[PDB]
Design an enzyme around this catalytic site. Structure first.
Site, PDB file in Angstrom:
ATOM      1  N   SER A 237       3.573   4.438   5.612  1.00 38.16           N
ATOM      2  CA  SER A 237       4.439   3.778   4.634  1.00 38.16           C
ATOM      3  C   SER A 237       5.880   3.770   5.130  1.00 38.16           C
ATOM      4  O   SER A 237       6.275   4.664   5.879  1.00 38.16           O
ATOM      5  CB  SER A 237       4.403   4.519   3.301  1.00 38.16           C
ATOM      6  OG  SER A 237       5.419   4.017   2.448  1.00 38.16           O
TER       7      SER A 237
ATOM      8  N   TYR B   7       5.884  13.024  -0.678  1.00 35.50           N
ATOM      9  CA  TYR B   7       5.091  11.873  -0.259  1.00 35.50           C
ATOM     10  C   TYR B   7       5.737  11.327   1.022  1.00 35.50           C
ATOM     11  O   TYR B   7       5.058  11.031   2.005  1.00 35.50           O
ATOM     12  CB  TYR B   7       5.107  10.811  -1.370  1.00 35.50           C
ATOM     13  CG  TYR B   7       4.435   9.492  -1.028  1.00 35.50           C
ATOM     14  CD1 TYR B   7       3.057   9.416  -0.808  1.00 35.50           C
ATOM     15  CD2 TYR B   7       5.186   8.323  -0.909  1.00 35.50           C
ATOM     16  CE1 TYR B   7       2.443   8.200  -0.473  1.00 35.50           C
ATOM     17  CE2 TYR B   7       4.586   7.106  -0.575  1.00 35.50           C
ATOM     18  CZ  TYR B   7       3.219   7.051  -0.358  1.00 35.50           C
ATOM     19  OH  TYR B   7       2.641   5.851  -0.009  1.00 35.50           O
TER      20      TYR B   7
HETATM   21  N1  NDP Z   1       0.789   0.262  -2.767  1.00 39.87           N
HETATM   22  C1  NDP Z   1       1.915   0.266  -2.029  1.00 39.87           C
HETATM   23  O1  NDP Z   1       2.953  -0.322  -2.244  1.00 39.87           O
HETATM   24  C2  NDP Z   1       1.859   1.157  -0.690  1.00 39.87           C
HETATM   25  C3  NDP Z   1       0.685   1.880  -0.357  1.00 39.87           C
HETATM   26  N2  NDP Z   1       0.699   2.658   0.871  1.00 39.87           N
HETATM   27  C4  NDP Z   1      -0.573   3.442   1.225  1.00 39.87           C
HETATM   28  O2  NDP Z   1      -1.759   2.846   0.795  1.00 39.87           O
HETATM   29  C5  NDP Z   1      -2.763   3.916   0.476  1.00 39.87           C
HETATM   30  C6  NDP Z   1      -3.173   3.845  -0.993  1.00 39.87           C
HETATM   31  O3  NDP Z   1      -3.869   2.655  -1.362  1.00 39.87           O
HETATM   32  P1  NDP Z   1      -3.262   1.484  -2.333  1.00 39.87           P
HETATM   33  O4  NDP Z   1      -2.160   1.596  -1.432  1.00 39.87           O
HETATM   34  O5  NDP Z   1      -4.325   0.632  -1.851  1.00 39.87           O
HETATM   35  O6  NDP Z   1      -3.718   2.597  -3.482  1.00 39.87           O
HETATM   36  P2  NDP Z   1      -4.863   2.681  -4.706  1.00 39.87           P
HETATM   37  O7  NDP Z   1      -4.891   1.234  -4.591  1.00 39.87           O
HETATM   38  O8  NDP Z   1      -3.908   3.609  -5.213  1.00 39.87           O
HETATM   39  O9  NDP Z   1      -5.895   3.317  -3.660  1.00 39.87           O
HETATM   40  C7  NDP Z   1      -6.028   4.802  -3.555  1.00 39.87           C
HETATM   41  C8  NDP Z   1      -7.239   4.974  -2.642  1.00 39.87           C
HETATM   42  O10 NDP Z   1      -7.344   6.272  -1.984  1.00 39.87           O
HETATM   43  C9  NDP Z   1      -8.240   7.052  -2.611  1.00 39.87           C
HETATM   44  N3  NDP Z   1      -7.854   8.394  -2.873  1.00 39.87           N
HETATM   45  C10 NDP Z   1      -6.683   8.943  -3.414  1.00 39.87           C
HETATM   46  N4  NDP Z   1      -6.731  10.244  -3.491  1.00 39.87           N
HETATM   47  C11 NDP Z   1      -7.971  10.606  -2.985  1.00 39.87           C
HETATM   48  C12 NDP Z   1      -8.656  11.842  -2.784  1.00 39.87           C
HETATM   49  N5  NDP Z   1      -8.189  13.091  -3.073  1.00 39.87           N
HETATM   50  N6  NDP Z   1      -9.943  11.811  -2.236  1.00 39.87           N
HETATM   51  C13 NDP Z   1     -10.496  10.591  -1.910  1.00 39.87           C
HETATM   52  N7  NDP Z   1      -9.934   9.421  -2.059  1.00 39.87           N
HETATM   53  C14 NDP Z   1      -8.661   9.465  -2.606  1.00 39.87           C
HETATM   54  C15 NDP Z   1      -8.701   6.323  -3.904  1.00 39.87           C
HETATM   55  O11 NDP Z   1      -9.957   6.756  -4.376  1.00 39.87           O
HETATM   56  P3  NDP Z   1     -10.393   6.536  -5.948  1.00 39.87           P
HETATM   57  O12 NDP Z   1      -9.192   6.194  -6.784  1.00 39.87           O
HETATM   58  O13 NDP Z   1     -11.723   7.028  -6.359  1.00 39.87           O
HETATM   59  O14 NDP Z   1      -9.916   7.911  -6.052  1.00 39.87           O
HETATM   60  C16 NDP Z   1      -8.574   4.833  -3.455  1.00 39.87           C
HETATM   61  O15 NDP Z   1      -9.595   4.209  -2.730  1.00 39.87           O
HETATM   62  C17 NDP Z   1      -2.034   5.219   0.827  1.00 39.87           C
HETATM   63  O16 NDP Z   1      -2.315   5.619   2.185  1.00 39.87           O
HETATM   64  C18 NDP Z   1      -0.618   4.799   0.529  1.00 39.87           C
HETATM   65  O17 NDP Z   1       0.369   5.738   0.921  1.00 39.87           O
HETATM   66  C19 NDP Z   1       1.838   2.689   1.704  1.00 39.87           C
HETATM   67  C20 NDP Z   1       2.951   1.949   1.300  1.00 39.87           C
HETATM   68  C21 NDP Z   1       3.055   1.153   0.111  1.00 39.87           C
END
Ligand code: NDP
Ligand code: NDP
Ligand code: NDP
Ligand code: NDP
Lengths: 271, 272, 271, 271
Positions: B147, B161
């Site tokens: 990120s 974070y």
């Molecule tokens: N959205 C944004 O603007 C930005 C996002 N990012 C990165 O993108 C990723 C997050 O995805 P989006 O961004 O798509 O987020 P959500 O759309 O928040 O996706 C979260 C994802 O990660 C999983 N997850 C979270 N915690 C756990 C855990 N303990 N064990 C297993 N799975 C877990 C969720 O599983 P489920 O919910 O079952 O748990 C889900 O598939 C991160 O790496 C984040 O830092 C980076 C910069 C900007």
């Protein structure tokens, strides 16, 4: 079909990265304006494209000096005259201009400075400004070719080539933000070592250049990936950056493609 | 066809970037292991893949906590038992874990430090170490999701974070160099704001989130390109980085994909 | 006097950061060459130094354009003539040259590109080349004055000024490594907003400038530290880097001094 | 007396950089709190202080594990008890923890990860949060000691020590912006090689370390400055960063002091 009906100007396409980049764009169905100074090598690029089953009506070859106003004007005009518009400009032409005595370091004459910046920076600036209104109309794109020599590590031998690329990077970032309000996307790629005509242009004989490549490729402190860069390796990134549908959200960035060269410290050459 | 006969593990594929990435990989011919904790959303991801013409044998759905030893082993082990190998590992799971008392800044509790790093950093490191022997055999690749919050600009609201992602960028660079000797390619992508389940996971109502997206997208000082990022924007880059044929020479880099957000200085929010 | 037996050339010392830096160096026992184009303002600086306990023999005033060969030569040679040596050079002269028609962004003309680099980049390069043999003999130092406008954030308004500074940073890093072998230390400082004659030179009225300073200082997303930068704030850093006994191990670095300005993202101006 | 009547906590001041830093602060008339685990080496620092002419009433020695809630509570408690306030906190304690079998690279165990970050990152975070209320009252300062190992170059051997420092840099930048609203200044210094007890703590025989220092210092691609770093070299920077009167405008920055090490590319080690 990725770039069907898109007109792309590729500076420095008479050799190396520019040549292969123009070839891919062509195969992708784009109108391409290839250009350089050596008429023989420019035609060779043209031939590679024709042998691809691509019409010559989709190709505009222009012999010109990109550091001159007339040369720049010819590249832009011949493209509009034959295609009626500009969708993408790839500022690829560049070179590490050597001294008549192979002088390196702080002692390189101010003449080397002038010549290097004129090509590696000023030309990029002038081409950008001249293509600008045409990109505003087509909501086009720009893809510049830089180098890891821009930094963050020092480059104490060909300093002017290095600072020109460093200036290039901020020019890429800055015009990207400026031009973004008009729907234009400006990006860049910063190559590590790639086998092209670069070393030969510096005065290196073909056999010495080959020795350079083998050494670099065989030593992990030099090129961690273990392979010498090839033109296609950079061309692929240029097309990716030019494919808005794919790389859309990337803006004002210069992707480093060096097999890991810039990630290794001098101390790490020793165990 | 790009990834035909390739096995990919996409952590955090039950929502957002991970979901779409998993979907694109499957459509590209890959065997895919999708995983997350929410069984309901994980199945949704699977249905989207199946209702695309993809056979159920090309999909391995795993419900697990990627922060635990057991969850990590299950993800990797079920992938091997189902597909026989691992070609690509995309460490996508992550989240800005909120403070239970809504506190931000330096004051965020230490408990949040531990949860945040265990997810955004430790999990990535353990998945890397655990998939490594299999990637050595397949001369595979790793694509992590960082990120722009990692830096170089300061991030005074959700610091744990931020430093977790900062640590991750150096992990990416370092394992890229360490693993290159085996023919492996490690890279990353650092997204700016993308519409996913990220803000919701943070406790934000969908109404506030939408207002956030619209505001960010309409102010050039926030997102210069003029549009909010979509899951696909990052998925395309991950696939590109996984495509050795195309991106080969890029190694140990984390491509910034933020519509220009990180290139804007705070002072530039004001006109001269 | 920590700079006793030290001779220092301070370019751009007829105003702002350069003036204060020259003052402090002289105040600390150094022989100083002050220079600029406005003789009236240059004399202003000399008087301040003299008003102290500093003898006029420790001060060498040179009215010259640092962008010309002759100007550059007068500065160096008069320094050698009066003091017999050169221990440290501070490449401080610099300015964001405006377009006569107030244009900004990619639209700024090439004439502005040439004038901006000639001063902010070329002059530094030439002064460096010209003092080199003498720094090699004295094992002296160089302290360049850059700007946070060099990067990593984009600068869509005064692009050429921005890229000249970006090139400057790589020139600082590269000459530091090249000249390190001679016992010379090259460093730099990259200031954020500082109250000097800078905005005035750009054409901004004094009233507007003060209004600019106040707004920047009162908005945390602009200047986190909550106070406008002052000449002395940058001067103190120059002296520290010029003080080998203290800053010795710092080499090829450009210390950022911007009250935190470059650390804030455009989005953070809302939250 | 630059720091007279100022109370400074220097973690890891029972050896290397912290010891020398504590000593300089003391000589500058500051109340100092020296802490470490080895009472023997800790008392050695104390002795060096007292022999400098500094009264032991301005010296508070504390033996404690900086990674425990207890150790840090004791460091802060005795400081407030004996001094009533805290003006500056220098998070210097740190180390590269080795594997039980000298394992390096990706294979280093999770145990190494935990131990490394707990000391190099977690402790800094905890000490920062615990001194915070006291620095808010005194509008104090914080100076952390990171390392060039944090990046931008890769560190494939001791990966965990590297990512902990990289996290430290963003923590420094972020707490600096956050705490700036209270008049507090947070900064840092990122050392290159410095002869201290660091290598010994890793398990390297003193003879080997000397071989390491000599080799690093004699190879330009290793340390361009031609000399190994000394603890005094870093201490000087820490005090500068702590001297608001001098370094005021610098905020949220980590000054690299490595003799130019991080500026040399792996390929540059070869002709
Ligand atoms: N959205 C944004 O603007 C930005 C996002 N990012 C990165 O993108 C990723 C997050 O995805 P989006 O961004 O798509 O987020 P959500 O759309 O928040 O996706 C979260 C994802 O990660 C999983 N997850 C979270 N915690 C756990 C855990 N303990 N064990 C297993 N799975 C877990 C969720 O599983 P489920 O919910 O079952 O748990 C889900 O598939 C991160 O790496 C984040 O830092 C980076 C910069 C900007
Ligand atoms: N090769 C490498 O390892 C690296 C290369 N790069 C960049 O790649 C580019 C050079 O291409 P390769 O890399 O393919 O180099 P060559 O293969 O060296 O290609 C040089 C290209 O630019 C053109 N060119 C040079 N000077 C001029 C001029 N005055 N007017 C018009 N065209 C000119 C050449 O034209 P023709 O010869 O007729 O003149 C040719 O097409 C530069 O931007 C360079 O900095 C960056 C990093 C590493
Ligand atoms: N003020 C700010 O906020 C910032 C300033 N900087 C840097 O500080 C420096 C400028 O100083 P301040 O910052 O003190 O600016 P002013 O206070 O603007 O000082 C300009 C100085 O440079 C000299 N100068 C300009 N052009 C020439 C020329 N052609 N020949 C000789 N001398 C010349 C001036 O000479 P006299 O007028 O006779 O000509 C004067 O001494 C530059 O390097 C600038 O980029 C960087 C970031 C922010
Ligand atoms: N030496 C080098 O080349 C470089 C050093 N650094 C940084 O310098 C610092 C280390 O100091 P030098 O560098 O002076 O190292 P030594 O000279 O190795 O000093 C280690 C110091 O930290 C203390 N320390 C270590 N672990 C703990 C712990 N668990 N609890 C309390 N105190 C502890 C030691 O206490 P005592 O042993 O009792 O425990 C001692 O004062 C680190 O922050 C390191 O990353 C950064 C870059 C290069």
């Amino acid at each position: 079909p990725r770039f069907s009906n898109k007109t792309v100007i590729i500076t420095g396409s008479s050799n190396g990265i520019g040549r292969t980049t123009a070839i891919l764009f062509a195969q992708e169905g784009a109108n391409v304006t290839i250009t350089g100074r050596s008429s023989e090598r420019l035609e060779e690029t043209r031939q590679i494209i024709l042998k691809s089953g691509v019409s010559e009506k989709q190709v505009n070859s222009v012999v010109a000096d990109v550091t001159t106003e007339d040369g720049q004007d010819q590249i832009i005009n011949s493209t509009l005259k034959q295609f009626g518009k500009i969708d993408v400009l790839v500022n690829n032409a560049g070179a590490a201009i050597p001294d008549a005595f192979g002088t390196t370091g702080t002692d390189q004459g101010i003449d080397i400075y002038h010549k290097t910046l004129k090509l590696n920076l000023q030309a990029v600036i002038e081409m950008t400004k001249k293509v600008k209104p045409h990109l505003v109309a087509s909501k086009g794109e720009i893809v510049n070719v830089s180098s890891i020599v821009a930094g963050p590590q020092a480059q104490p031998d060909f300093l002017y080539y290095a600072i020109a690329k460093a200036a290039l990077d901020q020019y890429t970032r800055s015009t990207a933000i400026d031009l973004a309000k008009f729907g234009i996307r400006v990006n860049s790629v910063s190559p590590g070592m790639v086998e092209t005509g670069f070393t030969n242009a510096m005065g290196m004989p073909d056999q010495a250049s080959q020795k350079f490549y083998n050494f670099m490729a065989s030593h992990k402190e030099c090129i961690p990936i273990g392979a010498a860069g090839k033109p296609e390796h950079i061309a692929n990134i240029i097309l990716f950056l030019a494919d808005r549908n794919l790389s859309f959200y990337i803006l004002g960035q210069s992707i480093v493609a060096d097999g890991g060269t810039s990630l290794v410290m001098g101390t790490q050459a020793h165990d």
